[PDB]
Write a protein that binds this ligand. Structure first.
Ligand SMILES: O=C(O)C[C@H](NC(=O)CP(=O)(O)O)C(=O)O
Ligand SMILES: O=C(O)C[C@H](NC(=O)CP(=O)(O)O)C(=O)O
Ligand SMILES: O=C(O)C[C@H](NC(=O)CP(=O)(O)O)C(=O)O
Ligand SMILES: [Zn+2]
Ligand SMILES: [Zn+2]
Lengths: 310, 146, 310, 146, 310
């Protein structure tokens, strides 16, 4: 059985440097040569209780690119949880008797973790739970970084935007702190700053991180500039001062950026990455979006097939 | 007539009260060079003209043609070190990208980041303007906003 | 490569008499004998940002009747464009890295045309863009006409209803003006009359068209009576006087109709075609609806397969 | 200079990229007689200089000190018989009515049919404008922003 | 004719030290010897386009104690401005043909000044315009300070709360800067600070003022502690952090206040004054509300009577 076979994938906090490296290796193998019938005869649930264009559609294309069948919903308003009061617990209890694995995105932190309490042997793959984690985002972010920098160890990575509610930077900061000698620069408004628990973790692991008030003061030393979007859905009224982007990247700022440096963004973007950056060599977010197909295909392959894509 | 020039373009024969429109619409004034504009100055040929000497900037054919919806008979002129090299004239331009705005309120062009674009055809009497996106066709006069 | 291979299908204005004839020939070939695995291993996006029962479900049945897989959404409210501010441009940029072709219906005129600017090599098939075009409607309308009249040249076709906002009569009037000697009769309230740009086009091509105030004054000379429904979703408050159907067809009016003449309607119908017409020999709209499967199957086959269904 | 006139006004020493704003802001285009605009003219001391010439016209009571707020060092030369009959430099008035828009969203000036009016106090570093209706006082930078 | 006869009371800014003193002298006279007929046969309009309990009912009780008649509204939802699009200019133009003075409260700053342009000969008295001015609040607060302190010069006045949107403190500060030697202490959260034009004026006048982050800093120094309420309805969404009171006054904090010191508040009060304060000799806010009857009777008496023998 490979190491991830039938594991639940809920938080980057439960995976090792090796588990990540495995996913990545399988992504490159399946990107190089396809496997159309690898998951023939499996039916996977797509349970999106929160908005999604990319995570849901890249997950369902991956399931389809491996022969599996998909069942699910994209909206909770017409589910019996929506109209009848079914609990998420009884919802997962019933869906576990039907499908071979459950992919679910949900607006409360902790939702994928409790699905596992009720899912039996059916693995639960977390497509984002509130402002907590988003593990498959980090698997395509890491594949895109490895792919454009050659390494995942010894990088300079700046994370800009809403880091309090950005579930993407929660998972990704915890994945890169598993490799050696990565330096962190964090650029957020004080109200949307990195949660203490990730900075603590950076500190006991001895990792070097620093706060910065502008993109320009780190533009020349960063290799990955990972931009995020203010999670306006998640803000409290107190925080409504922070709805507009404070740090907006325009192509001019890239005029002294390291030639290898790429600009990543999980997407959607609203005003923080201007569209003129789109034509510049550093822009890699749509490439990044595309790599979602290969990391999600690799992950499904490992959790549902005993063997190992050779 | 009016102020001298070494190298550049001098758009002469612009119909009256149109010279201004053209300074604005094709942004001709947003430069660090010397432009001289002669508004309402006597022509003779057709009574009164208006005209622009833009120094050290030359127009492409393509720019020059765009002027045909406003000043059809204008006469573009490039002067390389004072002598007239080429006297040109607008021919209506087949496409007018970026300058105009689709008057269809439900055109997608208004929401997304794409540049505007119109196909130009001498529609029998007026010049008709078909938006490349919503495909509705409009007279050139209305597209020039009300 | 066949002529339509990987072309975007956005407006009837960009297809030739030959491109239409091709689609039609392939429709008859695939209606006669099926091809279940013609599009095996392709995944097609179904992106409906506007309401649909028939265009979406006939398109997805066609994709399924040729072996392809479908991914998509029927509602924009739970897409990241719906809840997060993603632009249609970035939406198409991300979906282009996943699927082999994109079918999209959208409420703004011009939406499928700009998807093509951002879709890479992925073809965009227009399932209706606001009140502009609806090219696959015209392909099944033409297949049904050819099928009930034998010709597409030298027909008498009356179009009744909302012709200002009827995207169906915009495409169809432009497809039949590609064949020779068709006569047009237009029956609409003045406020919902044919757009100038189609009448101009009829005039420089020398085609004979005329305005008429009743169905009865043309009932005896028409071969195709193509009924439409007032696009109430698209009306301005000014036009709210025209919400009810002015011309309503009842079976009695058909009592002097040419014996070959059929009544077509893109559907939905509200009060303009009474249900007693449903039992009469001239009624062909549900047959027409069914032919959507064969024209949409043919179109997908041509845009995605290099070869030519023999 | 760059043109001469029997009688008219010549607004010289206009700061760059402001010259074009004045043809719109004073509507010196509803005119029949000649206007000479020289843009980005050298002025050794201030480098870039725009200059406007209006034949047969003299700027009214409003425009002169409204010009004070827009081009504070411009020099208005009243000409007749080609002689500089008067030279002027505008002063900041006590108030500017009609032309400025109150920055305060909730000022009634925006909803009702009344002419805006601001008081002009020349406040140490810059002009402060107090709105006659909402009584807030603003930096002139804010009030006549672009 | 007295100085205030037929004047519009729009802004404290337009009144001088002696107009103000004339109102307090008169309020004192009518508080002792009532005039039940002073305005017999005058009809005064009470037009409240924005919520009020105390300003509106103290004003129309004042009118009735002086023999006048009142007509008007407390809710513009039922006026022809509310339902039919009558401008405030045409509303005032019509109302001035009927009545002898207009008392107005409105939500846009600048509304009462506008009313005077249409008013004709009819005096307009400002019961509050948005966050600009509240002139009749200051005449009742100045009468109260005089009553308790016997002095309107050389006082130590602290103003606490939302000082940016508070029209009561914009008018009160302008009026106390007309007397000699008053010292101001402003305690407000940054977002809701004293607008600069009031500060500029204090400074241009040589008046001493200072900022403080607490009330304790100034408790032993002050003669009057003027509490205000956060103007939630005037806040911008970016200011919503500031909705809750930042400085709350409880009986305990009155620990070492001068014995003569009074706690004034325009009211309504939300959480900023605890109710135990109510039972201390320092709480003067309901005696202050009571003084509105005499200050407003005085003003109405002086604007509509040429000479008054009292
Ligand atoms: O929404 C974001 O800003 C980042 C991130 N975005 C995505 O995963 C893309 P989508 O919401 O279209 O699936 C998320 O956490 O949902
Ligand atoms: O709705 C109509 O009247 C005609 C036409 N109808 C259809 O295509 C059928 P549907 O909206 O169920 O896909 C359309 O333009 O959408
Ligand atoms: O509302 C306040 O906080 C103070 C002040 N309050 C009053 O005048 C009392 P009322 O709103 O009951 O007339 C106002 O400015 O409107
Ligand atoms: Zn358009
Ligand atoms: Zn104002």
């Amino acid at each position: 059985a490979n190491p991830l076979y039938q594991k639940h994938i809920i938080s980057i906090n439960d995976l090792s440097r090796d588990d990540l490296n495995l996913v990545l290796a399988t992504a490159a193998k399946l990107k190089a040569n396809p496997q159309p019938e690898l998951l023939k005869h499996k039916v996977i649930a797509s349970c999106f209780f929160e908005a999604s264009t990319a995570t849901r559609l890249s997950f369902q294309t991956s399931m389809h690119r491996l022969g599996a069948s998909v069942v699910g919903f994209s909206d909770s308003a017409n589910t019996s949880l929506g109209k009848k009061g079914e609990t998420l617990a009884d919802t997962i209890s019933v869906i576990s008797t039907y499908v071979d694995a459950i992919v679910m995105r949900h607006p409360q932190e902790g939702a994928a973790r409790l699905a596992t309490e009720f899912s039996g042997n059916v693995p639960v793959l977390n497509a984002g739970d509130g402002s907590n984690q988003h593990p498959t985002q980090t698997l395509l972010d890491l594949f895109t970084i490895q792919q454009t920098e050659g390494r995942l160890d010894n990088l300079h990575v700046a994370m800009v935007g809403d880091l309090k509610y950005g579930r993407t930077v929660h998972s990704l900061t915890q994945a890169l702190a598993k490799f050696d000698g990565n330096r962190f620069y964090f650029i957020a408004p004080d109200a949307l700053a990195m949660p203490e628990y990730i900075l603590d973790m950076l500190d006991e692991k001895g990792i070097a991180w620093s706060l910065h008030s502008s993109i320009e003061e780190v533009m020349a030393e960063v290799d990955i500039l990972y931009m995020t979007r203010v999670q306006k859905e998640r803000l409290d009224p107190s925080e409504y001062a922070n709805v507009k982007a404070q740090f907006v990247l325009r192509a001019s700022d890239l005029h002294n950026a390291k030639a290898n440096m790429k600009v990543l963004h999980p997407l959607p973007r609203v005003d923080e990455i201007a569209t003129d950056v789109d034509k510049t060599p550093h822009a890699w977010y749509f490439q990044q979006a595309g790599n979602g197909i290969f990391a999600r295909q690799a992950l499904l392959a490992l959790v549902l097939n005993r063997d190992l894509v050779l | 007539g009016v102020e001298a020039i070494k190298r550049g373009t001098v758009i002469d024969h612009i119909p009256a009260q149109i010279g201004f429109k053209l300074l604005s619409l094709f942004k001709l004034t947003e430069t660090d060079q010397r432009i001289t504009i002669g508004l309402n100055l006597p022509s003779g040929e057709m009574g009164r003209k208006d005209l622009i000497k833009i120094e050290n900037t030359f127009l492409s054919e393509d720019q020059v043609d765009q002027l045909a919806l406003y000043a059809p008979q204008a006469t573009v002129n490039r002067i390389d070190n004072y002598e007239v090299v080429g006297k040109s004239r607008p021919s209506l331009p087949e496409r007018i990208d970026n300058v105009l705005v689709c008057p269809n309120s439900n055109c997608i062009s208004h929401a997304e980041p794409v540049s505007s674009s119109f196909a130009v055809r001498k529609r029998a009497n007026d010049i008709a303007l078909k938006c490349k996106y919503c495909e509705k066709e409009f007279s050139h006069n209305v597209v020039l906003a009300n």
